[model samples]
Target: SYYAVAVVKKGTDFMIKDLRGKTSCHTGLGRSAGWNIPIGTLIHREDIEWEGIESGSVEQAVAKFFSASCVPGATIEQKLCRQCKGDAKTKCLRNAPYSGYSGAFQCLKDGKGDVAFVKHTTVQENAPEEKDEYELLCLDGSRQPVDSYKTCNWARVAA
Candidate 1:
């Protein structure tokens, strides 16, 4: 399963309907849990307005949706690079500071972002001791404990 997690103080107060203009954290640019699943999920829900994929419009949509993000990129939008904390040269690349699982978590933890999109085990592996402080964003507009991984997660195809 894939999950979108955030600190309860922030995550619990809002629903998916208010994700617009929120900062986001992702594992990588083209990876499943990080990019594909969440992007597709948002698109499926009619949240991120998209026109076309082949014409670079999908990137435009994502860029237009979130306020800023750490979606490690090769040539992705500059807005996605704003949340990344890497050096000038490392910014927005796969090797950027906020490019992977723990890195994405760090982005949320350090207040660089409002949410982190990752696989089921990401929080388990990186936040074992801080479990009670985090919650997963559910599609039904409620927040669940991170342990409720299976309760609301629907994108299960190993993303």
Candidate 2:
């Protein structure tokens, strides 16, 4: 089985084509919605040019793509964890300050990140009060309401 996830933002101005140089928030390093799917998408894109980190490490690759990012479980790569805030020792771990699907959304809300790679339900579940502020970045490079995951999503990940 696979989990359907979305890259959510607060407005329509953001798009897949705008990922480069923008900051991002993730549930954790190497997680389905957080790193793997998004990075895989970037890898297939001929538009976004990646530098600084090699293919050997996705963490570094992600760190290089976005001007700044906070991938909670990116404990191995200091760059990925640099934007994370909270506890010192656990800030970059899976247990870091904001390290889960919902936590990733929280990171974006804190203004530490411009986009959040989180599960489809994360924004709705965590911040229903501002549901109108959220939009999903579809794989087709289009943006849709978050609840439209049944018809659109960034990617599907294997369990």
Candidate 3:
């Protein structure tokens, strides 16, 4: 379970129109550590969970796994939520398809990506002035709200 509830600040553009059709990043780290993020494009390694703190090749095995795994199930793709809305494709991740970190934020901006998975901390990096909101895409048969900051539910975490 994760924090899928949609948070919004009045009088601001903070809502995902149709997240289901839109693309999002897929990272299993959210479960391993403590990071919750929607799917989309990422321009740099900063888009990952640890950001400045953790040091490793962001585009290693994890990325390869997401590319292969998250697709088989239609639920994750179908789980759409209107949380944050901003056209800062360059500053933030885009909702194109298969968008991942190349180097820094500027690199991914050159192209469009589906959705990006990142920690709550990273959201501020994208838009410090604007607060980000998120909603859990209830894919499993239970159809329950995303409970905590962790992305996947118990079952998926084990998988």
TM-score of each: 0.89, 0.85, 0.25
Q: State the lDDT of candidate 1 residue by residue for 114-152, as single tens digits.
A: 888876677779878887778878888888887887775
Among these predictions, the greatest TM-score belongs to 1
Ranking by lDDT: 1, 2, 3
For 1-159, candidate 3 gives per-residue lDDT tens digits of 222222222333323443323333332323221122332212222233422325443333233223222211122222221121233232123332222221112121222223344332333455455433322322232222223435433212221
Q: Give Cα distance to truth, residue 122, candidate 1, Å.
A: 1.4
Query: Model 2, range 1-159, lDDT digits (tens) per residue?
Result: 344565555653867787788888888877888887877878878544454444466565666677887887664567787678887787877876788887788888888888888777787688888888877777777887878886677676666
Give the CA lDDT, 0 to 100, for residue 62 in model 1.
Answer: 89
RMSD of each: 2.4, 2.4, 14.0
Error of 3 at 136 (Å): 6.1
- Candidate 2's displacement at residue 142, Å, is 1.6
Q: Candidate 1 vs candidate 2: which has greater lDDT?
A: 1
The 10-residue segment with the lowest total lDDT in model 1:
3-12
Candidate 2, residue 17: the lDDT equals 81
